[PDB]
Amino acid sequence: KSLGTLNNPATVQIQFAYDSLRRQINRMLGDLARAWC
């Protein structure tokens, strides 16, 4: 038996771009919420 590797080396890099941009936006929202408080 074997694991079915797919020849798509782009899925991992697309996930990083979404994950990286998500982390920074959520931090900006937290900083803005504190100032409004």
Binding site: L6, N8, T11
Partner: protein, 41 residues
């Protein structure tokens, strides 16, 4: 999600000339002929 258009098997099966079929049968025929030509006991 992970997706792909053409798998490895699809690209392998897109060839008209089957090298494995051609050579395996050719060697089998020659080996059988060499048996009758020689002492086949």
């Amino acid at each position: 999600a992970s997706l792909e258009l053409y798998s490895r098997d699809e690209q392998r099966a897109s060839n008209v000339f089957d090298l494995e079929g051609i050579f395996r049968e050719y060697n089998f025929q020659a080996q059988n002929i060499a048996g009758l030509r020689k002492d086949l006991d």
